[PDB]
């Protein structure tokens, strides 16, 4: 095959032939705003690039066909990116999120590999034939690190260096090349970071860098050129092309720079998801983020229990494990202003209220199969009855508690009052009751009523100013609320007895609650904190994550025991009720209706 040079500049990726007279021609791409890093897969005839402005990493054939954005979420400054041509994996480094991530070349099974004690990684280079991974860091103390291509065995390789760029591996001669942007030099070392040599010390402004055969190539922002020199002496210098201002990255598109082999190239290591190379030339099987590797070291299992917390324009997920895996943002599209979230553990789908679109939407954690349940209206809070498959939500515009099936079919209104202001809400269908804050003017209340609207009881009417969040734990028989004005979080029994203040200090704006098992999580929007307290009392109050802007809600998800779920008498086709299925104190069921219907003589159906 023929070798040619690709370079990025402005919103264009262009091609320069090294055999022919330099015929600068652009690759017919579309939708590119600011192309930066570049890589390729010669066996696929595909090119890969990152877009710093659009915060994406994309792929396309050399003819421009099959243009795909394989990474669209969770990016800030994707400066480093590299293609694992053996295991068919995509690596990238984000200077903003301070993360080294991996995924398939099509974007599936995205996983975080390095995230702890990582300050601004810039360039990234891969050596999958050996199983090593090299990157530069522009952190507090710039250096060049190394680790296995599964994220393990992280170490400092070159500590004594400035902010390096264009990290390139000479696979034939076992040397690392980089451009020190602080000292304006082109340097080289061996694979161990020793035997440092200065290749070119008289260049005005080198930036991009790549290596091919006996030559190194670089871009010079001062001479506005792409130049070439002997990779050893730095001599025999030549200009490949001039009048090219601010070229970001360069590479030689040729099969001689993607050689070698490993077990991932032959059988994907029989891994179900990710086949990650490790020294020396071996492999290990990897899983998507928050997935766990089974005992066979091949297959991956999805997380069964986790925490969800939402921001204004994002919905995130978090687990509790030993290695302390990082939180991820779920690829949910078109999030504008998320106010509250919920989760159906049966069909494993995510629900949320978007206050700007003023609707209740639904999708999986994949982001696929999006569907709007409710569409003026102003949904405020929501709570899912997972047994009767209904959503109990409050409408800030009409001041009612409205019930809707998961598929969008309306059940009806179960609560409405002249001066009622129902806001926060949580459903307890194991006992047949619901709890909601009633923010009446200068008289806020926390009330309880049956799931059909009857048996209204004010549980609390004093010591409140702006009760804004609610949580409930049915096994403990406990209700939890958080007052944003009084700046405290309280607890009480479901009956209303034993009201106690859990925390009332160092709390600015609590706007969400959830219970895991023995822990009570909450979010402080003003402090940008997610904290938790131990309810059994053994451990103390701890922070779990900080610097989270525009927090809106938090929701814990517990693995569903299906046989205990089927034992709930409303799980078997609503217990014969055409609308509201009510559990009564004896364990049996009763049927009821929304307020625009009446129960008929058959004690099962509701008619107008």
């Amino acid at each position: 095959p023929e070798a040619f040079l690709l370079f990025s500049r402005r919103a264009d990726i262009r091609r320069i032939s090294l055999e022919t007279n330099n015929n600068n021609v652009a690759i017919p791409l579309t939708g590119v705003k600011e192309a930066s890093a570049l890589d390729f897969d010669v066996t696929d005839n595909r090119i890969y690039w990152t877009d710093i402005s659009l915060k994406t990493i994309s792929r396309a054939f050399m003819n421009g066909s099959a243009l795909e954005h394989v990474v669209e979420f969770g990016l800030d400054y994707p400066e480093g990116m590299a293609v694992d041509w053996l295991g068919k994996n995509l690596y990238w480094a984000d200077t903003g999120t301070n993360r080294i991530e991996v995924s398939k070349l099509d974007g599936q099974h995205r996983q975080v590999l390095v995230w702890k004690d990582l300050d601004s990684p810039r360039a990234l280079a891969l050596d999958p034939a050996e199983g090593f991974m090299y990157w530069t860091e522009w952190g507090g103390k710039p250096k060049i690190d190394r680790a296995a291509m599964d994220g393990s065995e992280r170490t400092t390789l070159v500590p004594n260096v400035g902010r390096a760029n264009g990290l390139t591996i000479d696979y034939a001669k076992r040397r690392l090349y980089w451009t020190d942007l602080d000292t304006n030099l082109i340097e080289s070392s061996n694979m161990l970071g020793l035997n440092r040599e200065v290749i070119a010390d008289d260049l005005p402004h080198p930036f991009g860098l790549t290596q091919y055969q006996d030559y190194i190539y670089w871009t010079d922002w001062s001479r506005r050129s792409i130049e070439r020199a002997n990779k050893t002496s730095g001599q025999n210098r030549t200009i490949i092309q001039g009048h090219l201002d601010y070229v970001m990255d360069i590479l030689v598109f040729h099969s001689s720079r993607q050689s070698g082999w490993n077990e991932c190239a032959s059988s994907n290591g029989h891994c179900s998801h990710l086949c990650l190379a490790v020294p020396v030339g071996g492999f290990v099987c990897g899983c998507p983020a928050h997935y766990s590797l089974n005992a066979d070291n091949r297959t991956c299992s999805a997380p069964t229990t986790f925490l969800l917390f939402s921001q204004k324009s994002a919905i995130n997920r978090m687990v509790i494990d030993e290695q302390q895996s990082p939180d991820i943002i779920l690829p949910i599209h078109s999030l504008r202003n998320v106010r509250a979230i919920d989760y159906d553990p049966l069909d494993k789908q995510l629900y949320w209220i978007d206050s700007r679109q003023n609707m209740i939407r639904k999708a999986q954690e994949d982001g696929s199969q999006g569907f709007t349940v409710v569409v003026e209206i102003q949904p405020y809070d929501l709570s899912i009855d997972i047994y009767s498959r209904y959503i109990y939500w409050t409408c800030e515009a009409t001041n009612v508690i409205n019930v809707t099936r998961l598929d969008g079919r309306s059940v009806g209104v179960v609560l409405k009052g002249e001066q009622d202001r129902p806001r926060a809400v949580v459903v307890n269908p194991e006992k047949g009751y619901m709890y909601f804050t009633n923010l009446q003017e200068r008289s806020p209340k926390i009330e309880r009523a049956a799931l059909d609207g009857t048996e209204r009881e004010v549980l609390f009417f004093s010591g409140l100013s702006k009760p804004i969040a609610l949580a409930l734990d049915s096994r403990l028989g406990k209700l939890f609320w958080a007052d944003s004005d009084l700046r405290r979080i309280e607890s009480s029994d479901l009956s209303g007895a034993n009201r106690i203040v859990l925390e009332d200090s160092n709390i600015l704006q609590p706007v969400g609650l959830t219970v895991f098992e023995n822990w009570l999580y909450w979010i402080d929007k003003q402090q940008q904190m997610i904290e938790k307290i131990d309810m059994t009392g053994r451990e103390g109050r701890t922070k779990v994550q900080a610097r989270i802007a525009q927090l809106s809600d938090i929701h814990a998800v517990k693995e569903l025991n299906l046989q205990e779920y089927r034992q709930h008498p409303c799980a078997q086709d609503n217990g014969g009720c055409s609308h509201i299925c009510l559990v009564k104190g004896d364990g049996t069921t009763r049927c009821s209706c929304p307020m625009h219907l009446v129960l008929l003589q058959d004690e099962l159906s509701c008619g107008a």
Partner: nanobody
Amino acid sequence: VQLQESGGCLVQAGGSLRLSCAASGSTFSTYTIGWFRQAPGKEREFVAAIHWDGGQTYYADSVKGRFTISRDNAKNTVYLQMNSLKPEDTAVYYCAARGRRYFDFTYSDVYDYWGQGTQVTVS
């Protein structure tokens, strides 16, 4: 982040003038500050850019040798020293900032913050 230019006024041909760009809401240690100018009936033109951390400077050919961009060690302020002013230097000079260090500084679309601009007229 907010930016406020100042220093523009009427000035003679061959005279000098220094513009300044006051900045707020950051330490700007991760920012690039650039100067642009736009004359009536013309496209916006890149003038100069500087790394707040690093000191690397970049200039357009039309202002080389005549214009110098510099950084204040005290008051979060970037200066544009303009010597040997031609009549063609007449434009509204804008101050731009972006939280990224190495990129195409002439690419005005990718900057994140802009000021109100200040008018420089050269007779």
